[PDB]
Amino acid sequence: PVSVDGETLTVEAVRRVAEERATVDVPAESIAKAQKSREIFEGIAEQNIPIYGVTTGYGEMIYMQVDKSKEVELQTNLVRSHSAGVGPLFAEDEARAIVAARLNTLAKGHSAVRPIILERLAQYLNEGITPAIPEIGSLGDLAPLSHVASTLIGEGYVLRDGRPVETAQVLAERGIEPLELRFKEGLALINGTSGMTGLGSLVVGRALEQAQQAEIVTALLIEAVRGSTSPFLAEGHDIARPHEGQIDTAANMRALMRGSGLTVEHADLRRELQKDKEAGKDVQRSEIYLQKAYSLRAIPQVVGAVRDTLYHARHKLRIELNSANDNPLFFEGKEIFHGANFHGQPIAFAMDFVTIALTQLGVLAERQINRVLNRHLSYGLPEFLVSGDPGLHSGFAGAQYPATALVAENRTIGPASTQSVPSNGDNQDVVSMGLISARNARRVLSNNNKILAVEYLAAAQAVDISGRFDGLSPAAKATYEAVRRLVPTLGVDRYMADDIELVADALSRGEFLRAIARETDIQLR
Amino acid sequence: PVSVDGETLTVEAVRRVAEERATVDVPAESIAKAQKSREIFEGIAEQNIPIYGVTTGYGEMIYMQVDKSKEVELQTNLVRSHSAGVGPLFAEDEARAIVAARLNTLAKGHSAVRPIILERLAQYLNEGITPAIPEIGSLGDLAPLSHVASTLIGEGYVLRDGRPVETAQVLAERGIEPLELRFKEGLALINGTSGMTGLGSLVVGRALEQAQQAEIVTALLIEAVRGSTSPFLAEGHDIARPHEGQIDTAANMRALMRGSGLTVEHADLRRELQKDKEAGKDVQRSEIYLQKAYSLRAIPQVVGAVRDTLYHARHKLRIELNSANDNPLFFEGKEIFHGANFHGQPIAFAMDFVTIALTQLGVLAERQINRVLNRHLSYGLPEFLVSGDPGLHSGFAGAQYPATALVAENRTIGPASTQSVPSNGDNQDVVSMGLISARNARRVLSNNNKILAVEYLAAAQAVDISGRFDGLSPAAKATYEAVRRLVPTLGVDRYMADDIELVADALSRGEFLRAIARETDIQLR
Amino acid sequence: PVSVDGETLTVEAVRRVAEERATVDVPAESIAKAQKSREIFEGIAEQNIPIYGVTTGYGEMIYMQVDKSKEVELQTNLVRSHSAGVGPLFAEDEARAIVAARLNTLAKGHSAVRPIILERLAQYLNEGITPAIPEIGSLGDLAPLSHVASTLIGEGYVLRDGRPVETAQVLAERGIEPLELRFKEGLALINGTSGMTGLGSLVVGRALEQAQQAEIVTALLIEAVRGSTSPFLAEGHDIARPHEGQIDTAANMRALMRGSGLTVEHADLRRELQKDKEAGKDVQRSEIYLQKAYSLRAIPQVVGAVRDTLYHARHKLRIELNSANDNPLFFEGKEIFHGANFHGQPIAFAMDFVTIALTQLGVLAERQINRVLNRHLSYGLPEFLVSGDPGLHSGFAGAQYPATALVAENRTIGPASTQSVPSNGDNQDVVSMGLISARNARRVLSNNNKILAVEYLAAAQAVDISGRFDGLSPAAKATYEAVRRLVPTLGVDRYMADDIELVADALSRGEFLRAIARETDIQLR
Numbered sequence A, B, C: 001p002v003s004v005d006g007e008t009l010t011v012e013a014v015r016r017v018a019e020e021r022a023t024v025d026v027p028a029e030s031i032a033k034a035q036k037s038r039e040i041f042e043g044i045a046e047q048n049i050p051i052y053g054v055t056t057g058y059g060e061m062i063y064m065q066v067d068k069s070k071e072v073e074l075q076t077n078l079v080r081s082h083s084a085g086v087g088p089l090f091a092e093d094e095a096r097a098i099v100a101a102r103l104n105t106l107a108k109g110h111s112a113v114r115p116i117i118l119e120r121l122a123q124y125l126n127e128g129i130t131p132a133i134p135e136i137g138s139l140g141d142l143a144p145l146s147h148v149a150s151t152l153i154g155e156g157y158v159l160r161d162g163r164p165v166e167t168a169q170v171l172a173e174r175g176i177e178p179l180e181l182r183f184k185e186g187l188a189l190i191n192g193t194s195g196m197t198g199l200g201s202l203v204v205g206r207a208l209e210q211a212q213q214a215e216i217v218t219a220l221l222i223e224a225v226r227g228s229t230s231p232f233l234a235e236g237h238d239i240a241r242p243h244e245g246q247i248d249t250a251a252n253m254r255a256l257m258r259g260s261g262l263t264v265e266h267a268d269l270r271r272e273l274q275k276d277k278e279a280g281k282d283v284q285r286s287e288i289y290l291q292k293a294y295s296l297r298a299i300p301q302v303v304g305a306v307r308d309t310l311y312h313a314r315h316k317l318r319i320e321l322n323s324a325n326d327n328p329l330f331f332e333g334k335e336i337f338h339g340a341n342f343h344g345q346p347i348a349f350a351m352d353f354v355t356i357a358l359t360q361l362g363v364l365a366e367r368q369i370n371r372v373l374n375r376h377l378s379y380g381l382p383e384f385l386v387s388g389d390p391g392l393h394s395g396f397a398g399a400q401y402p403a404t405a406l407v408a409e410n411r412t413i414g415p416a417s418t419q420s421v422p423s424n425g426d427n428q429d430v431v432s433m434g435l436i437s438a439r440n441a442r443r444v445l446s447n448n449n450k451i452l453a454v455e456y457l458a459a460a461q462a463v464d465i466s467g468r469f470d471g472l473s474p475a476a477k478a479t480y481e482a483v484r485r486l487v488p489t490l491g492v493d494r495y496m497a498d499d500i501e502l503v504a505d506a507l508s509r510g511e512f513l514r515a516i517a518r519e520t521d522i523q524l525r
């Protein structure tokens, strides 16, 4: 069971809860801290003193003073009037991540919510009650979270088979009585970054796995075209250019290609080249390349930079998950804190950066595909990997286009964290648009799986056409077999879409990262 | 019935076929021209002479010479190997538009396809057989069109209830025998801009209707806040700044607000202001605004610029629809033309421009919403249009956010027509990415309907709160009633998402443009 | 003196050398290590062994083997043939930063360059000989660096009074005999990321000062409008939301406003509002805002996020500065390393992230200007800060425009790190475009100084119009005085451009940061 204590939750744990449906538990210690905060807070609210969103109107209308006799109505009107999300609904796993993020925030203890709220959110996750959350509305996450809050009071909708179903009916069925929103509970539930933080957690965790699966297919490809191992030597990174991500990619590449009979060492290349040179010629041509193109040599640098970005984002998300992103906040023995911890700028920035890094990861993958399909670059392989008669057959020629087109499409996705537009009578004059940033990243992530899908298919085909399977390392043979388990070698031309979608789906669920886990003793970073 | 002659097809007709399921007919004259082209062409191919994609490999592999004995296989292998589209499938109406565009292209007579191909495409449209076309793959439209071509030879998939169904089964059922691809027919079916041109036609036609529905709600709003009519006077446009689009918007605005008892003439404003001024004061304050903010005065200029862009795009699309966007091409008494009329640059540019214009249309609408919800700008209306007790109730405060957020999101959509990436061994070193451009435009179009939805709801609410219904013009009363038919006045706060989605859907099907048609004698440009 | 040892150079140290003309010194240990590497390397090159760029052609032409007898010409043709930079020339400080970065790289000892190369570079820096480097041409930094290398062999141009003068006469004009490039020296001088890393260091270092100067005027503004101190309370950050940047900004804000008689504590605002509410009624209006708008409240969250991005970039840059970003590389007892440490992806990403972070910093600054100029938003200030009769005078109304316009302009700047385009026969099939990223960030940084200048002038004017000078904290008074030393109070309308440029220049110089350090006991993070 995952412990939601608002203190030690990790991105990986969030994914277990969201994707693996792992059980959630709010420890007794967190419940005690919440109960104490609530009790003291109630005493303050009971005195009818000014507290944002508790005894005042919302946003710009904070100038309106509301009596404590309107407690439940104030909180209820907020949730209803703000459930104005539009567009597609988040998938079940995305919605679960968002709920889990909100639960952890409140579990931290500074939101002054009744323990029952924590218990109910925990119950929805544990019993599989998934809110229907529209993806659009947050300025960075009122709208999305208001739809979640609605399901707690028996309103709004819950997701069932990808379809929204009236919450009232679902609760009546599952035998659950809706809650009533007391002081600050409506606001606490919707005043945070849980939308972008929950979705961002899924994206970043998956992005790291995508970085690994890119390294996996890259290694197979390098072996297929017999590239040099020189670029991955530890000295060039650990010593010469110690960027953390760069060090990790190189280490993974070395581990992945360990045991290969196809890769060539620099010592062997220069020797083969020295013999091919004759001695009375000052300048002479050679068909031997002492070094390969950037797409097969600058992998540690590029994928490493992507990793560095992903590491930074995961770090920010971990901090955010275990933060009290709510307002106002309760701190014992202190005035009620009135700030802006609901502002998602830190995460909006983080996700816009992930979008950029992942776009480049796809740019690299796409150029690697170009490399093996172009006879002028493939190094001995037939044009477009045609096994039979080229021309009559196009092989993988048409399969390159969707990959190329996706690189262009990802490049049309611009940063959202800088696109703030003032609203609410200028009260919200600077916002983060962080959920848009997170959805942009999810999109590139999804597009990259299609790009990698074509690369995995091209790599396996290259192995088949060159008859180099027996020369592959243990990891490469495993990668090759994983692909071939889904899609057969390309003999004569054939409809490609189903083949590409099948491998794309495998990538999305981390099947190749699994193959290596299961088939080799390799532990990827 | 719509006449598909490759000569006079209009964007409106395309939409009738796609959306209204209007019958298609290829006139006898077009059939005769096709039959003649095919017969002469066959005689040429029969001689086994070099003809791109007929007796040669494809793209970069044009260096491969293929004997006429491989006729059917060559064309078949192309269609199969290039059916590599990925992502979501186009909706039924979008797919129909694409098919219709391809049919019109071939109907022009320079593609040298057998009349049967025209007849079959026409049959699929007339019998409701809709190809399952993945949205991603085109570099600008091989992949998408290859999936369409597949359905003609009993391969690929057809769309049924939003689900892809094996074409073979559908044809066996409907009692139809798949065709065989003869010389050049596989290539002719997929070598064009029909994907971006077909989808672009739907978008542009709808965009013009969106421009009209923006003018409709703008007029209602202007009447509700009693704005000045001065900005719309014909002299300021027809004479002073004759941009075509600007002239049309002003004319529509004048027609829409004709008969209003709420709008004020400049003569009345200056007089009311002159009386409010006293005479011994050189500088004095007044609560009277002789002119209103840009969002209620610069409508002809902004919406007019949007119209100009839409007019240009529709013109380009009309030309493209009735062009032979295929290669190579047959011209009697001439060598076979080997060019690049498959290159979608003209349309890629057009659609990127539509994306930009529509984004601004939404920017304007969103600021008009801000105008009526902000008590400092609304001109007498209650804050956020709250009918009861503000603070306790937020009214439309939360509904503004999805509109604001969509403006930011549309701004994250960048031009695709400039993002060419070389592929196919550098043979396709400069592409247009036009289908991405068209899908970008469709997205902004769709987002704008949600923005306008909030504006229509805010406008009607403003009419209710100010009690100005009886002062509304005939068109305004009609617009108001149209909205109220779907959604009730906002008394106490309530869940808003369903209300917003309902009006957004009405906008997408042109319900407000219809209300004016049906209820007034106004004929909008 | 600044020690360029390839191990401990900092971003600050780079700026001292570049901006303050600080003397550079390559430690004897570095020279010794270089010497050692050079001796061993020379022994290998003498064997006519295959080494990239030493005994082979460059880039794609690596298939060409070049005999050691062509030692000097090979290196020379390279530098000449690649000196193809275009566009404007870098400023003297920028050029110096680039040279310093390259020198530090070679000082690491793995480039196998003769010590004289290190010495001559250090001499150029110490003697004020600045290379004329055009800004465009790097794919991420061959062209920029080739222009630098040219000056070492008496070719290309040197920068004098902003104009390029032939290096030949400049060297003669000061008794320096040009050098002759030997094995690997030409390549080592131009094969790295020193262009983007040198410029990036300057930008990031100045960006941190900009964040501080943003916090400085923001604090002044908050005091001028009597804002609440609640948002900056440590507990809200150090405890509730532990983001490093957020914690730093909050700490800085508390220190900047310490001792203010104008700011209000939450407790006082709360009591003040309590006193204003009547009993009985459960909903009543008030003119008191318990909380201020976001632009005055989520400073820690927004600027903190900017800071986190800047800290990450500085970290990347420090690592890069002290790395062997060159190829091939020498490691004693190992084969010559043939990798891609010249690939600027880590820096390209970092600078693209800085561009985004700084854009939002300006967004916030501009909305703060809007707050103070708008009578409906500013607390106790006349419209547009007009001292006399408004209407007759516009005050700062016209000055808001350039700030607003710059936010829009910065938003048109897109990421460059993802815009790779393949070149050099596809050898450079995946590049970083990092120098473009670095120049993008520089542009936003520069634009922000103008936006901020308007904010500084507006803040000072607000102090004068409200007569709140005596209530200002020590830091606020110092800021006010610094502004007033440059520009006087705005009485009647006047030409504004010179005043704005004056304050903008002061900002670029870090004058306001210096005012706080020279007049107060504050130490800003």
Ligand SMILES: *O[C@H](C(=O)O)[C@@H](O)c1ccc(F)cc1
Pocket (backbone or CB within 6 Å): C053, C058, C059, C060, C082, C142, C187, C191, C327, C328, C342, C424
């Ligand atoms: O990135 C190249 C390398 O060192 O591998 C660089 O030296 C280079 C210089 C000049 C060229 F024309 C191509 C590459």
